[PDB]
Design a protein around this nucleic acid. Structure first.
Ligand SMILES: [Zn+2]
Ligand SMILES: [Zn+2]
Lengths: 200, 200
DNA sequence: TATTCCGATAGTGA
DNA sequence: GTCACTATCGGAAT
């Protein structure tokens, strides 16, 4: 099944150059279809935990949540900032980049192996091809890793999000269902953010 | 306006080789986007009648209706059969062709100059490109010229027809909204009809 | 809400 | 229900 496509990264990380980190516990791998300039996946290698739904992970597996956050903010932090500088600009400091990165799970992932998204905010990417892509990362469907448990969405409830009008995440401008127009505007927003960020 | 596109044929039929007949009263012209193998338009040149709605023509202009029918069955009859043989097959007799030709108005034409469609039944044509095309010629939206007045549709009432599932005019097979599949089937139906018709 | 391919659907401009 | 262009929307296979 296509839904098991990610299992090869946790089973044989030694085989993939796009696996930019692995140890006995986790794998950090580049998303094959990046939905922002930088888009990485952090995957547990635990044979049981990998098949636990991310909302259940957030609710009842706080040790794993803390462990993943610890990887992101510690041992993988330098690596992630270098990936971001290569994907965006060498001229961007850790401080600028940290405020331009989000980390979270999809509330309804299609792939069955638990994967934590670590990505830049731009959503400027050739692989961003439709409204559902965009909405999945910019609505409550994207469950940020620091969401309090009492604020988690209920499994299966967010279907209707995907039919809503499009709004730019940065400035709030609306685009109805005109995805192509949104796309062009996201480019502009990135150009703007970059100019402002390097200008210090 | 694009809606006045046909007026050139009644104003200056002398200028167009695809005007296959003209006199002081009418013009017979090839449809520029034929929706069957043969698709002709018979147009009154009368400055007033040309802008009368076809349903009003059918209801209250019986002399013009009779005159158009007289052209079709009389002085233009040989011409129409030749067009049909060239468009379909030389091997088809007048008798076979007469049962494979329909004559009628659209209940809601876009073009403003009154035009009577004279066309073969096949609907096999590169210009037949969507469901609305097909439905416009095979439903009550196509008002056959011999429709009794008491059985005419009311102006503006047939909008909903265009959303219905597709059915083959010849054998009744249904295709949902799969237009491409209908198209392929119409080809087959034409091949079948042709084989049967020349086989005397 | 995995991608990709095809095709139906919708709005516009002329 | 003029055409033609663009883009959105929808199902199916993988
Ligand atoms: Zn914006
Ligand atoms: Zn049929």
């Amino acid at each position: 099944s296509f839904r098991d496509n990610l299992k090869v990264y946790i089973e044989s990380p030694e085989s993939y150059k796009n696996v930019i980190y692995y140890d006995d516990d986790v794998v950090l791998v580049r998303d094959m279809f990046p939905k922002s300039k930088m888009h990485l996946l952090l995957m547990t290698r635990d044979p049981h935990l990998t098949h636990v739904h991310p909302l259940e992970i957030m609710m009842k597996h706080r040790s794993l949540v803390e462990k993943l956050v610890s990887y992101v903010q510690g041992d993988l932090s330098g690596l992630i900032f270098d990936e971001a500088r290569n994907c965006l600009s060498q001229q961007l400091t850790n401080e600028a980049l940290a405020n331009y990165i989000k980390v979270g799970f999809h509330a309804g992932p299609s792939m069955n192996n638990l994967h934590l998204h670590i990505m830049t905010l731009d959503h400027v990417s050739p692989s961003l091809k439709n409204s559902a892509h965009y909405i999945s990362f910019t609505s409550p469907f994207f469950v940020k890793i620091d969401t309090p448990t009492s604020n988690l969405p209920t499994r299966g409830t967010l279907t209707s999000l995907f039919q809503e009008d499009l709004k730019c995440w940065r400035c709030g401008e609306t685009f109805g269902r005109h995805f192509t127009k949104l796309k062009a505007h996201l480019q502009e927003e990135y150009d703007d953010w970059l100019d402002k960020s390097v200008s210090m």
